[model samples]
Target chain A: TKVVCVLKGDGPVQGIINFEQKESNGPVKVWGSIKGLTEGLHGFHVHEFGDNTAGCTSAGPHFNPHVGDLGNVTADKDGVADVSIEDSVISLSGDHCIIGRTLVVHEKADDSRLACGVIGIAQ
Target chain B: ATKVVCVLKGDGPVQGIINFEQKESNGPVKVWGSIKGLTEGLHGFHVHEFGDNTAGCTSAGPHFNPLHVGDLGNVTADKDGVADVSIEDSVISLSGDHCIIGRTLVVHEKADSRLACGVIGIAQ
Candidate 1:
């Protein structure tokens, strides 16, 4: 899966998060990188709606298929966060499969959006 | 339970996911991660002291070196700012007093300029 963000005034977290599901019922090895974010901590998670046509205003809240606030994406001084993940919160084909949603990295101060990417099949 | 720690970045930040598993009971923790956005030069990689991100990378504190090489030495990336690193260290642990759980692994531009960081935890 590729990730995109919709930052408000000065958002730069435009990167891709790829998912590699190897086992039939195994975990998805999610890995990807975001670029162009301010040097700080930001809320990271899957939003309820994948429709960015409405911009981040209506992407809804975090996609709580099972949990909330998976965690934060911290950009270093150089503005980068190298990430590696292992999990089962989402799936490729299931009730909670996040094929049509938004990956929102938000600003910590106001809980406002920083960037958003539609969750879709990798092209 | 599998959990993943993703360090955020902007514009040329390093990014990748790492997975670890004990090949044997109380054995070495096999580690691997694909890190991006590194500059062309030598960089130091080591486990840090904390997992608090309220203050960003600096909050990770000092190296988690307990009885072995705290400094994991230099990892040189290519001209493309990429380095695929894999190593078995005795200093880092998944358990015990030196267990790096909830700690962090930081990549440095030199030995001081902390560049990239990722928290070590369960990949569920």
Candidate 2:
């Protein structure tokens, strides 16, 4: 059961929104247009929670390790446990609860939104 | 419901939809919140404070971090392959004496600070 979404509130926000739907087949199909914006690039992504309920506060803090990854910004930025690095204690980017999470538009950018999604489903 | 508007599309975009919390703000409040559709993948993200309306949008600045980390220490990341790129930031505004304020975020398409951004929101 793949789902589709469209931003209809504001005109154009940059580097602000993020999503994660478990129901997606390969990738959650994203579609829309930026008729009015800063006329530049911005960041986009699926954060860790959906704050659509009570302002952006509903969304919790950045997905952090409730365990060992609790030290300062690890010296290993990209090495925070992906498919590459391994540390039973550290984690950089883990999976988020997409369904109840949230997404947004920033007044800035996210260089190709940092990374990109599949197109219609998630990996 | 707090809604958002996308302005760009990343190279792919489906890396995954994570979390994103936003607000239909008025004045010095810029875009804020997290997204949630990522498959445990990494993505470059940021919040723009300004650069909206008027011809001086580009003049806006980066996130107002009380904890400042400069280019060297701040930008102490391996950016050689991406060194040629310049990180663009967003800026929000405020008028204290009288009254006024506003801000927002902007995402790019590529890393090392690429171009073309979009908006994020909560999945229904």
Candidate 3:
């Protein structure tokens, strides 16, 4: 099943809205949401778990795709569908399978948790 | 700090008619409330525990239920089309659990408070 989530950063958030399917093959889909991001630069990425409840603290970790070869969302590094920053920005694809999970919009830049909150099921 | 938020989509664009679930909370004056361009309708708005920052603000978590839950109240108005839906004029010693800090205000796409967003804060 394909899912489309329209994130709301409140401000002009400029980031990615990537996703990974729960399959053993490879990533399912990846996208970069260039709506209203901050005005400078951002370090976006897919956390480990789903913050569906907006409980960013609960969105788990940085998704240990590719056996933890790279650290947090590297700048523009790309490894296997599991590791690598791929392009720049963040990775919408990885072993994390964050498709229906949650996407946090960090308050700070990726410099901090931005913590913001996970893309929990709020409606 | 007053934040006025509005969505533009759908057929023409995400226009008014959206308000997230009702959120309840009570705490110190460490924080304040603000409003603006709040869709002129019977909008039911409230604070949520999480700051709905999803790609579409639909993932800001639950309401700021320091106590109650769901769209318990309603935000309505006439003439001017502006409403303070929940936050009334009074020294809210904020009762109950007290909403969380990282909280965020959102305007649903249907019920609750359908419009944009607004916040309360003084220019630093």
Candidate 4:
């Protein structure tokens, strides 16, 4: 499965995120790059819904499986975020399948969702 | 497509189409369009920030400058209140970071007053 993110809310930003299942019982490997982000760390997470008609705000809360913050992706100082996350709480199958959820990148915290993408099954 | 057109508007007798597009990939964009129903003189030409026309030209905001904020200057009209002009600029784009899709393009009647405006979008 792969989720392609398109940056929104006025700025020169663009990126894509890839998810690959390396093992049947292992966590899904997440990797991608996002450009035109502000320098420093940003909160990255999967939200409950994928509808972004009202920008990233309509995506709902973080898809926290059962614990605290799960998949945390970060960017460098050049407004670009390279991602890699491995966690047991998230999956591509069973009840945790995020095929229809939303992947969001925010500014200050999880509250400032700047860009959004819909998670779907890759071809 | 190598051409995009902007349908202009003003509260008065100002309206026409501004046909423009990129000359080549990563190159300057060339503009060619008909301007009619002005004061038979020069009118300001520029690319603005927002494409929304909810409050007329005021909603378009300031000049669009991802690299450098500047205007392409006034276009002269004829005695019959028409200005058919063509110019090129290296500041705008049809793709990548500097892409101008969803932004407003304005033709002003003065330094602040607008004669007509339009949004930059894909041509049908």
DockQ of each: 0.04, 0.05, 0.06, 0.02
True contacts kept of each: 0.00, 0.10, 0.03, 0.00
Measured with C-alpha atoms, the lDDT of residue B92 in candidate 4 is: 73
Best by DockQ: 3
Query: Which should have the higher DockQ, number 1 or number 3?
Result: 3
TM-score, cand. 4: 0.48
Candidate 1 residues lying further than 4 Å off, grouped into runs, are: A1-123, B1-12, B67-70
Q: What level of docking quality does candidate 4 show?
A: incorrect
Q: Write the per-residue lDDT of candidate 3 for residues A1-123, one digit (tens) a residue.
A: 222333444444334333334444544444444434334444444555433233345455554442211223322222111222333222323333333234444434444444322222123
lDDT of 1 by residue, B1-104 (tens): 12223332323477555445554545666666666788887778776665433344666677765553345656767889887777666555555565554455
Candidate 4 lDDT over A1-123, as tens digits, reads 332333444455556666767655677777778888887777777776544435567667776543224444566788788877766667765557554456777776433677765454332
Q: For model 2, how does the per-residue alpha-carbon lDDT over A1-123 read when each residue is reduced to its tens digit?
A: 222222223332212111233342333333333323444443333344333343344444433323211112111222221111122322112332232233333344433112111111111
TM-score of every candidate's chain A: 0.79, 0.41, 0.44, 0.81
Q: lDDT of candidate 3?
A: 0.35
List where candidate 4 sits over 4 angstroms from the true fold: A1-123, B67-70
- Tens-place lDDT per residue, model 2, B1-124, is 2333223333443222222222423232333333332223233444343323121223224542322111111111132212112232222212222111122233333333423233233332
Model 3 chain B worst lDDT window (10 residues): B1-10
Tell me the lDDT of candidate 4: 0.64
Best by lDDT: 4
